[PDB]
């Protein structure tokens, strides 16, 4: 993409939280509720420069391509399995291609954290989005 305007850097965190139902749901075999998300590193409004964020799920989901156009940029679902989510962050139209992130959805609590009684599984990472203002 040709660079138009000022190149800026915006830190983010992204990833998921998940919680176990405590039993397998018979209707669909689902065992966990989870939320995948992208957030600014500090408490600021990302919609000023983010147009939309797309979360591509595994084909076992009926609509695998979820698009969020307004904050908070998150998707909540239920399921039984861990898989890679493809996150595409599109910026306001001074610029063209999205930033692509890959996130391995984490559902299953470690034995260590289970013995500590931790109820929520979290897998979160830092990144820096580079795009044109």
């Amino acid at each position: 993409s040709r660079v138009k305007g000022v190149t800026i850097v915006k830190p983010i965190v992204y990833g998921n939280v998940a919680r176990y139902f405590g039993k397998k749901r018979e209707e669909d075999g689902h065992t966990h509720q989870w939320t995948v998300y992208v957030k600014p590193y500090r408490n600021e409004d990302m919609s000023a420069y983010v147009k939309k964020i797309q979360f591509k799920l595994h084909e076992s989901y009926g609509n695998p391509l979820r698009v969020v156009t307004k904050p908070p940029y998150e998707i909540t679902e239920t399921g039984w399995g861990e898989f890679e989510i493809i996150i595409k962050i599109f910026f306001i139209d001074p610029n063209e291609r999205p930033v692509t992130l890959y996130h391995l959805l984490k559902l299953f609590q470690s034995d260590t954290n289970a013995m500590l009684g931790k109820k929520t599984v979290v897998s979160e990472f830092y990144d820096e989005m580079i795009f044109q203002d």
């Binding site: 595994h58 076992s60 399995g81 898989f83 890679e84 559902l107």
Partner: peptide, 7 residues
């Protein structure tokens, strides 16, 4: 199944 794992 496949790229999706139970546990």
């Amino acid at each position: 199944s496949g790229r999706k794992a139970q546990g």
